Design a protein around this ligand. Structure first.
Ligand code: CUA
Ligand code: CUA
Ligand SMILES: [Cu+2]
Ligand SMILES: [Cu+2]
Ligand SMILES: [Zn+2]
Ligand SMILES: [Zn+2]
Ligand SMILES: [Zn+2]
Lengths: 382, 213, 382
């Protein structure tokens, strides 16, 4: 929710999410659900999106229907913003605790610095149970174990009510008397200054001194309990460990790529050329969270969101094994309602008709090669 | 008698001069005016500069000099009959100013605009700079002053004063410079209008409105 | 035109252009001329020139005396801005169609983002013929083939005239009546409001309604014809393919480098040391578009602009073959009027007396090694 309305080429050429997995589809309150995967920051990052020098690994949901217990880019826990580097692939892991009963479309998203929430695929997860069951316990370096759901709640309230009351008390003191039309006219013809006088100005400095007094008393009383406190921990984490990917064995070349307007399909003419040594076939074209597969070749088992998985969405003019050393040109068609439903079709309103995706190739014994393609994508109407 | 085609001078004097200029650059824009480090630039274009600056200081000194001395000393008593003739000549000066501004602020300005798009500048002294800044602007400023002074020295209402809007109108250009407000004219018209209607209130102008017109 | 006046060191240490070639020196209206070559973004890019994160491959001419039909950096067509990367070398190719008869000094230039047009060498090319002959045909994805010279011209004109006329019509309507000195006075003593009244205010709303009406009619009429339209395509192209250069086999070391003031020559004391295995000689020093050659060693054939080519401009104290494994110190002098004509001599006014060039070495069988030098360049007066 929130992708779809954002520019189709940003969605294509910004971050690619793959090897996504969700530990659970249905979950009880207080239970854990773990999201894993990889993302690539596209080498051809658009203009116009500040490079992800300060990015944040977020979660796309309707507020705290879950809470984020942990998050990890590379091996590292990531509660700050992190510097990601264009071109690199990373593995992430988000760990959610369930908090509100319902049906939630949970996404994994990146937050970028200068302009943009970069929203990955969303999967529906269901939380059963009562919100009154939810606990967020946390042990401090100070001994105590508290519940973050309610920690410091009453304190917060008290101080607010107390100070609010005093606010009222002060206006209340002055409003025993008549407030406007008499006081206004006294000021007018002739002098005011009959309107105020100690005992008024005693009360004035009563309040004034009492206020300063209570603040300092309260503060060094608050310092007395809670003598051990740190400042908010902040600051972008550099040195994110990227994934070391083997150099791919297939290389592809995109000669023209077109889409029908209106339509539900993108054609592209690829010259796939198989270096390395096992007969290779094309199994998937991933484009903007939308996955087009040739079921002749590959079948998702990870339960990828049903609306984004095009089971036999991908057709190759010739998808026989491509022998090692051999190179062929092939016409490929990615085709599925998702192309219209997730509005990739809206690329026609974009000021940069260029797409970008990942192709996944599979050899005989089922091990894979990931090449990335990008190219201009040109409309055809007639 | 009344207001002559001494005006036709004012309109054609710029028109001819500036149309000669537009021809002149038109032929030497390309030829000499491209490479400033060629000696044909220091003759057809640089000499042009020194010539104009000198001609401007001179004509400015002569033109303002002239009018300030021929300032009407016995202004106190001269007829409404001429308080019109003069008011009209003043208006010719303003037409000359406005025309002069047109050429400077619209014509040669957005021309220089095109010139920048088509060649990377070799100097702060391109042809269109020699013409836009150091020919075009001094001219309309000199015209500006002339008018102002004419009014101050020739018409009561304007004498014993220094009109604000008019001063602002005339010196305003001195605080307009580029990289890397002339609406006062209104105030100064609403003035020159009143200036026209001292005896010339009558009217028309309130009489022959309440009738024919 | 426009180099020369720009800072001599900017010109030395910004972009190096070499292997320039021009397919023709004289050309008929509507004919093609193709510019090719290579450029290196200098590793020691000055301060003060924004890195070429957003640069544009332009052409240096007096307007559209030619039109740029095509431009290529690496393999890719480059109608947008492009991100070039410091240190790298690229090959470009501009393709120009002739449009205006005459003698044009065409340059190949880079347009950089934050301060600077980076102007390459310019070569004189002559166009013969009539401008009335020029055509710029283009076929749309919409069926129609149009001439860009005049496409949509009449339309533009109509709509401007029409609206312009209506503007006049409005002032016209009011100016049938007297304009200033009566209307001014009426406002003064006593009230105005006799000055305007329907039928005036009928015409007022006549115009007002007529205008909104014609705009919307016109718009959805313009939408009826031309129902297929895209937004301006824009946005910096990333991922420019740089050229894969073999590591050079010669290495040079610049110990002192001086120029005479005033003068036409730059001396430098190089220690050339020939690794790799064929007796090597020095054949050229390229500096700021100006190419200095030892004609005992190398001869231009490409017709490099005559004012920038110093045929035997370059003299080496000892330019015998430098044996492999051997290493020697040599005094080199680049000398030619071009040094004063293109104002490299104007380095004496620059806040950064450092130069930068390319040296070209040639072995016995005539294959070449390019090393780049930069160093401080110091004046000598006495
Ligand atoms: Cu938000 Cu699915
Ligand atoms: Cu333009 Cu040399
Ligand atoms: Cu990617
Ligand atoms: Cu270089
Ligand atoms: Zn299931
Ligand atoms: Zn200018
Ligand atoms: Zn030649």
């Amino acid at each position: 929710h929130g992708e779809k309305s954002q520019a189709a080429f940003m969605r294509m050429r910004t971050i690619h999410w793959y090897d996504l997995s969700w530990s659970k589809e249905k979950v009880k309150i207080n239970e854990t659900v773990e999201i894993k995967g990889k993302f690539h920051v596209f080498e051809g990052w658009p203009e116009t999106v500040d490079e992800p020098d300060v990015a944040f690994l977020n979660v796309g949901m309707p507020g705290p229907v879950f809470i984020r217990k942990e998050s990890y880019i590379g091996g590292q826990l990531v509660p700050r913003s992190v510097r990601l580097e264009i071109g690199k692939t990373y593995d992430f892991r988000v760990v959610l605790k369930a908090r509100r009963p319902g049906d939630w479309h949970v996404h994994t998203m990146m937050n970028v610095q200068g302009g943009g929430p970069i929203i990955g695929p969303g999967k529906w997860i269901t939380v059963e149970g009562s919100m009154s069951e939810f606990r967020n316990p946390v042990t401090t370096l100070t001994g105590q174990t508290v519940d973050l759901e309610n920690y410091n709640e009453g304190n917060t309230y008290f101080w607010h009510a107390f100070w609010f009351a005093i606010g009222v008390a002060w206006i209340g003191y002055w409003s025993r008397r008549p407030i406007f039309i008499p006081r206004l006219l006294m000021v007018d013809a002739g002098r005011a200054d009959e309107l105020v006088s100690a005992t008024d100005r005693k009360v004035a400095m009563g309040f004034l001194a009492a206020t300063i007094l209570i603040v300092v008393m309260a503060m060094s009383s608050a310092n007395s309990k809670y003598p051990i406190t740190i400042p908010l921990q902040a600051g972008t984490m550099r040195g994110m460990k990227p994934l070391e990917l083997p150099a791919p064995t297939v290389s592809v070349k995109v000669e023209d790529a077109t889409y029908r307007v209106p339509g539900r399909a993108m054609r592209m003419k690829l010259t796939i050329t198989n270096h390395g040594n096992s007969p290779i076939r094309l199994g998937e074209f991933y484009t903007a969270s939308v996955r087009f597969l040739d079921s002749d070749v590959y079948k998702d088992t990870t339960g990828y969101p049903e609306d984004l998985l095009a089971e036999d969405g991908l057709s190759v003019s010739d998808n026989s094994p491509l022998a090692p050393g051999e190179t062929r040109t092939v016409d490929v068609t990615a085709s599925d309602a998702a192309w219209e439903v997730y509005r990739l079709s809206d690329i026609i309103y974009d000021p940069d008709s260029r797409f970008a995706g990942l192709l996944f190739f599979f050899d005989a014994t089922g091990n894979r090669q990931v090449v990335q393609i990008d190219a201009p994508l040109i409309p055809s109407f007639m | 008698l009344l207001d002559k085609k001494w005006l036709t001078f004012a309109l054609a004097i710029y028109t001819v001069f500036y149309l000669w200029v537009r021809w002149y650059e038109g032929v030497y824009g390309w030829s000499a005016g491209l490479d400033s480090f060629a000696p044909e630039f220091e003759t057809y274009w640089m000499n042009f500069l020194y010539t104009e600056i000198v001609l401007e200081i001179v004509t400015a000194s002569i033109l303002w000099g002239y009018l300030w001395k021929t300032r009407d000393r016995n202004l106190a008593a001269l007829t409404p009959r001429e308080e019109l003739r003069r008011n009209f000549t003043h208006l010719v000066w303003l037409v000359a100013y406005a025309w002069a501004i047109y050429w400077g602020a619209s014509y040669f300005t957005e021309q220089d605009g095109t010139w920048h798009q088509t060649i990377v500048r070799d100097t702060d002294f391109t042809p269109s700079h020699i013409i836009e800044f150091y020919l075009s602007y001094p001219i309309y400023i000199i015209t500006g002053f002339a008018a102002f002074i004419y009014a101050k020295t020739r018409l009561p209402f304007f004498a014993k004063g220094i009109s604000l809007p008019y001063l602002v109108l005339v010196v305003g250009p001195f605080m307009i410079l580029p990289n890397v407000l002339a609406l006062a004219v209104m105030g100064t018209l609403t003035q020159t209008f009143y200036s026209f209607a001292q005896g010339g209130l009558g009217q028309s102008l309130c009489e022959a409105v309440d009738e024919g017109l």
